[PDB]
Ligand binder design. Structure first.
Ligand SMILES: OCc1cccc2c1OCCO2
Ligand SMILES: [Cl-]
Lengths: 140, 141
């Protein structure tokens, strides 16, 4: 359903990459953070929800997600708190481009760009960015 | 007003710089507090924006950050056409003021304001938000 996202962390170069996947489309948002703190997580969730209509997020077990800053952000934004493949693709691409830039955070945004624009399938296929927008637009 | 066209503008507040991109056809906004209007910060903001929405053309204020070759390079790589100097933000500073006392730091208040802006129904109860308008305009199927 159009409002559901899943969030995962990937540790790399001594930093964390926070990755949200829009489950129905495979579309991705990601950010590089210093550590998976409650405040970082809350801020990331607030940005996501101000850009897309987030109803529910699926997370893992981390103490970041139960922090009071994350609960305050979720209450304010209206988010209920509770792919392997899209993530495996993502880290794959960061791998294939990491060399083209100094900072991890540059290579990560380049990987997001490449993931979200890439057409899947044949001549009549769609990119993840197209799928998420088509899904949401249809929902109304 | 076509679908790939964004306008980028700077606002200065509490001695901080806010970079704002507006999708001209819908009024939808993306915004971030950045350290200063450097080429590298500008390039990175644009790269993030264009990986999330299909950005074909950007209208900028022709600031020295946009004329740098590091912005030019980011635009070439992303397939974005720069129109430098070619031709509600006071409502943003307003919304920022309406949420400012629920957040210690300006950057959090900015993202709250971005959220209120893109959710707001414009034109009475019969109308649509900027978030509904951008998806409507941009969807290919
Ligand atoms: O895709 C964006 C979108 C689609 C529908 C509603 C929205 C919205 O953005 C932020 C809030 O409201
Ligand atoms: Cl600017």
């Amino acid at each position: 359903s159009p409002g559901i996202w899943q969030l995962d962390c990937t540790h790399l170069e001594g930093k964390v990459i926070l990755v949200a996947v829009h489950v129905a489309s495979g579309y991705i948002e990601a950010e590089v953070i210093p550590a998976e703190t409650g405040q970082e997580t809350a801020y990331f969730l607030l940005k996501l929800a101000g850009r897309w209509p987030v109803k529910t997020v699926h997370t893992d077990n981390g103490s970041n997600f139960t922090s009071t800053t994350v609960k305050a952000a979720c209450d304010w934004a209206g988010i209920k708190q509770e792919i392997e493949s899209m993530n495996k693709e993502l880290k794959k691409i960061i791998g294939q481009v990491r060399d083209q830039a100094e900072h991890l955070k540059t290579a990560v945004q380049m990987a997001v760009f490449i993931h979200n624009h890439k057409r899947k399938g044949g001549i009549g296929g769609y990119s993840a960015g197209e799928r998420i927008v088509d899904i949401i637009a249809t929902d109304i």
